[PDB]
Amino acid sequence: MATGDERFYAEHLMPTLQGLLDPESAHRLAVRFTSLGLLPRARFQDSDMLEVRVLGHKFRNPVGIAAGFDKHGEAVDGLYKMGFGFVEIGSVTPKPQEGNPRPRVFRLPEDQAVINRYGFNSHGLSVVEHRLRARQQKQAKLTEDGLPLGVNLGKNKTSVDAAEDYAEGVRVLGPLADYLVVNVSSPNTAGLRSLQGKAELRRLLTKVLQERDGLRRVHRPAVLVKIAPDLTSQDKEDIASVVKELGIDGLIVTNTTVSRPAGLQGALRSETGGLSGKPLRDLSTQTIREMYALTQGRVPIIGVGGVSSGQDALEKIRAGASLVQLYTALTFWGPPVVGKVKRELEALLKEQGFGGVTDAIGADHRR
Ligand SMILES: Cc1cc2nc3c(=O)[nH]c(=O)nc-3n(C[C@H](O)[C@H](O)[C@H](O)COP(=O)(O)O)c2cc1C
Ligand SMILES: CC(=C/CC/C(C)=C\Cc1c(O)c(Cl)c(C)c(C=O)c1O)/C=C/C(=O)C(C)(C)O
Ligand SMILES: O=C(O)c1cc(=O)[nH]c(=O)[nH]1
């Protein structure tokens, strides 16, 4: 019906449909089509070389969908069908909220970048809870079969106590997640990034971990903190210190950037919001490299930001990522980008003498 070529989607289908629809409508349609399974079932069969064991789980391949694509947990099964080794939904806030006024998402095709200022539009914990409960046992089997689920938590715009927002997310969605993400790095909620500060972070994560440890064993997720690419060296040292002090299970590195790298060409480069895609790529990779060294390679990292190829994935893995995610590449290349990243990553691992993804994790640090 629509299956299923790399060049066709990249050269013809995606540029045409982008020319027809504003970015938010395009996203909604993508979510709808994905959730109905109106995609080719990915033809790439994952080799054993791509398997990774981390965070108390087996991951059939190390390529996941980043938070923000499926904010409300509507397309999880369709995303596994697309070939992702793991799915992260969210960010989800405790109460439903509409997010920022439109327009709030912008394409920069000359930069293969996106700028967004959604501001945590979210159906809320209760809606997402029911959505996930309706397939909880199916997810238990997928997880067992190497396809884990992450749930990314945010906070409401008008909440007084941020820590109580994240605590409520742990209590409600923690029992449905293989891992939870404390998202303290959205650039689109006022004051949120200040929660990355040493004292605020320590207090917030102590409470998050207390809540998590009170869940029954079979419903007890790993806890990860998702961080910005715009941190000072001091901020990064402080995060690494808190992570090790508290026994945080992992880091997601990185969210979108509020910087605007010299050289951006897109007409919309000066829109407010987080920048994603290719201009973020090496900034994200360098942040992974730093965080890996500061945590002595002992804290699993999910690397994210501008991944659109096997080389992009492998650079992050060698810099210290155990797993990678992508989002923005999907908006330019479409669904075929997933098999593309996996096939190229496998070829490059073979070319560089690695036995598998596991041998490559942090390899640059051992040179
Ligand atoms: C439109 C859009 C919405 C996003 N929403 C979220 C979100 O709700 N929570 C989150 O932690 N990250 C969010 N992100 C960030 C992505 O998860 C990822 O960290 C970032 O876009 C870098 O990856 P990419 O270059 O592959 O897109 C969003 C990104 C985009 C482009
Ligand atoms: C039939 C079809 C049309 C895709 C919608 C278009 C024209 C662009 C996709 C697109 C975008 O153009 C933009 Cl800007 C965003 C933010 C998103 C986010 O999901 C996005 O998916 C299928 C799309 C997909 O399967 C994916 C690749 C998931 O978007
Ligand atoms: O909802 C959003 O605005 C959003 C959240 C986030 O974590 N990152 C992002 O780029 N946008």
From Swiss-Prot:
An annotated Gene Ontology molecular function: dihydroorotase activity
Sites where the protein binds substrate: K71, N116, R117, Y118, G119, F120, N183, V184, S185, S186, P187, N188, N255, T256
Similarity annotation: Belongs to the dihydroorotate dehydrogenase family. Type 2 subfamily.
This protein's name: Dihydroorotate dehydrogenase (quinone), mitochondrial
The organism's place on the tree of life at top rank: Eukaryota
Gene expressing this chain: DHODH
Main localisation: mitochondrion
Miscellaneous note of the record: The identification of DHODH defects as the cause of postaxial acrofacial dysostosis (POADS) was obtained via exome sequencing, demonstrating that this method is a powerful tool for identifying genes underlying rare Mendelian disorders. Exome sequencing consists of targeted resequencing of all protein-coding subsequences, which requires around 5% as much sequencing as a whole human genome.
Membrane topology value: Single-pass membrane protein
Disease link: Postaxial acrofacial dysostosis: An autosomal recessive syndrome characterized by severe micrognathia, cleft lip and/or palate, hypoplasia or aplasia of the posterior elements of the limbs, coloboma of the eyelids and supernumerary nipples.
Pfam families linked to this entry: DHO_dh
InterPro entries documented for this protein: Aldolase_TIM (IPR013785), DHO_dehydrogenase (IPR050074), Dihydroorotate_DH_2 (IPR005719), Dihydroorotate_DH_cat (IPR005720), Dihydroorotate_DH_CS (IPR001295)
PANTHER family associated with the record: DIHYDROOROTATE DEHYDROGENASE (QUINONE), MITOCHONDRIAL (PTHR48109:SF4), DIHYDROOROTATE DEHYDROGENASE (QUINONE), MITOCHONDRIAL-RELATED (PTHR48109)
Biological process, per Gene Ontology: 'de novo' pyrimidine nucleobase biosynthetic process; 'de novo' UMP biosynthetic process; pyrimidine ribonucleotide biosynthetic process; UDP biosynthetic process
UniProt: FMN binding residues: A67, G68, F69, D70, K71, S91, N152, N183, K226, T254, G277, G306, Y327, T328
Record keywords, A-Z: Disease variant, Flavoprotein, FMN, Membrane, Mitochondrion, Mitochondrion inner membrane, Oxidoreductase, Pyrimidine biosynthesis, Transit peptide, Transmembrane, Transmembrane helix
GO cellular component: cytosol; mitochondrial inner membrane; mitochondrion; nucleoplasm
Keyword Hydrolase among record annotations: no
Entry EC number(s): 1.3.5.2
PTM per Swiss-Prot/TrEMBL: The uncleaved transit peptide is required for mitochondrial targeting and proper membrane integration.
Disulphide-bridged cysteine pairs: none
Protein's cellular compartments: Mitochondrion inner membrane
Keyword Transit peptide annotated: yes
Role according to the record: Catalyzes the conversion of dihydroorotate to orotate with quinone as electron acceptor. Required for UMP biosynthesis via de novo pathway.
